[PDB]
Write a protein that binds this ligand. Sequence first.
Ligand SMILES: NCCCCCC(O)(P(=O)(O)O)P(=O)(O)O
Ligand SMILES: [Mg+2]
Ligand SMILES: [Mg+2]
Ligand SMILES: [Mg+2]
Length: 310
Amino acid sequence: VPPSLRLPVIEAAFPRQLHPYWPKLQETTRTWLLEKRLMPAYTDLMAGYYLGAPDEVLQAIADYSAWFSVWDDRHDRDIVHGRAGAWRRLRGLLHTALDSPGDHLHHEDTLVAGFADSVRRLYAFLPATWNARFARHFHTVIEAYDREFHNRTRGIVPGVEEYLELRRLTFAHWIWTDLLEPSSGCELPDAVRKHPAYRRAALLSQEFAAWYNDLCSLPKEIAGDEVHNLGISLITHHSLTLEEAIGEVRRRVEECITEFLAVERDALRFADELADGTVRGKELSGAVRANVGNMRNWFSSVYWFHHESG
Ligand SMILES: NCCCCCC(O)(P(=O)(O)O)P(=O)(O)O
Ligand SMILES: [Mg+2]
Ligand SMILES: [Mg+2]
Ligand SMILES: [Mg+2]
């Protein structure tokens, strides 16, 4: 790891974890991409994150994660080609397929059909109230991708706070947070997952992942003159040099880690409180503990992914 990207606290205090299903995961996702014609003839990131997930849940999550990267690529291609109509039509179909995936399983657009299959499968694990929350969150993600389309085709660099708000949606913070719950086998009650310690631990895990991605791409994403990156917002609106922007993003990433360590303690104290001597409480306690454990695993999975992925 180059010194500008190295984070000793991750290396020393966040040991990597790997889900035992990882070998089958890689090839089964590749087979799904081929069968769905989503790439002409990433799973490790999920296998280091959703520890404890049932094999079938981890497979559905990995296929969705692979689909997501194929969507990011189509979005980028529509942007650089100025295909505003094609993007608008896709945007509309993803909104519709999210609410009615079965209707879109054999759509002419293979990206839409692949999306529908992955969502249909994710909808099969937990009650319909979880499905509705996933859908609510992902409708918001789609519209954030539309805002990025608008910004990038017009060459607009969002302000720092504007970007930070937008990135919580284009990175899909709340989708990865939602997916903790099928991974530990339990839809959490609103009073549990909205506990301030759970909420803050969940946020910091995703801010680390998004901002570290921005750090691992700032120099390349200048050069070619991009606009969506915390470092680019800092250079453009705060007159930072590239070196100054790298240091500022790095400090913000480092603070996510030590803020997370403090709130993790509170979240695990909350998990202890949930185990109140009843079976239901022990089950909720264990689900919270598992989910917070995987919020922690996201730090190390993301960190080492950026130094392994091409
Ligand atoms: N966690 C590592 C995968 C995150 C990929 C993030 C992106 O898709 P990438 O930097 O790969 O293009 P985004 O469009 O949000 O910048
Ligand atoms: Mg991208
Ligand atoms: Mg993107
Ligand atoms: Mg990025």
